[PDB]
Paper text:
In this work, we have explored the structure and function of such non-insect OBPs in the mite Varroa destructor, a major pest of honey bee. Mass spectrometric analysis demonstrated that the six cysteines VdesOBPs, whose sequence position do not match the pattern in insect OBPs, are paired into three disulphide bridges (C1–C6, C2–C3 and C4–C5) different from that (C1–C3, C2–C5, C4–C6) of their insect counterparts. The overall folding, determined for VdesOBP1, is also novel and different from the conserved structure of insect OBPs, although some similar aspects can be recognised. Comparison with classical OBPs reveals that the second of the six α-helices found in them is lacking in VdesOBP1.
Numbering used by the authors:
A (entry chain A), B (entry chain B): 7 to 147
Write the structure that this text describes.
Amino acid sequence: SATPAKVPVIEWGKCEQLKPSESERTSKAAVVDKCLQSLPLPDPEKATQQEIDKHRESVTTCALKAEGWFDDEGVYKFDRARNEIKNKKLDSEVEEAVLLKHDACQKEATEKHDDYINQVQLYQACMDYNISQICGIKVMV
Amino acid sequence: SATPAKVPVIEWGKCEQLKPSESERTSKAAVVDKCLQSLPLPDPEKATQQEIDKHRESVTTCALKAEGWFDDEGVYKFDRARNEIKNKKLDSEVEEAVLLKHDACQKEATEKHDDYINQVQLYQACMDYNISQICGIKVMV
Ligand code: NA
């Protein structure tokens, strides 16, 4: 095809439960597409890397805000994230290790950053890395 | 979320007709997941860039083969790709321009490369660039 669909290419290791469902994927696309209506993509013929990076940030924040991830003080809902991991029903030994890294990643994020957006950015990066390590997940880049 | 779904972030410009449906997206995931059961991701502790690149090429080949995109000799079905563009029902001026590029991308691919896989790789990159330009499509990297 001249227009192939692009999908993630991931081996889930010990953690097949973390693979998004078709439904979860369709949900997220709807959120992102709505965010893009207000946050159009920068012109790649003209945009600077900084403009691209800050626009990307704005879309990630939009999707988290639209789906309820910040409280009335603007703080990311770390306890919601924890409960969502428990709801995946990982194998018990993996769950325990992931939930310990949740605490470690929340601590790292909150001690490094006072900015609530920087906190969630570092927490998500921290969990992407640590979940990948615990689970043996490989992602094609 | 500690495990957000990752989705394309694209503005489709003049060419919303090219956005994959949920069905098309789900089929491509099913094909890629089946391809990975035989074409495992290389271990980044050990993998060369050549091994990583050749593995990525194999997944693309695998998914194209699963969907019927090669004849029995191994040649990519360029005329199928051409007819699939016409069946998108783009605006007439857009279609005209995209089909001129299809023919020119095919001719470049076959003149530059004798390897059938190299031919489809060049054609798809050529069409990604040219369809994006004609349509005004922006894709977040
Ligand atoms: Na915990």
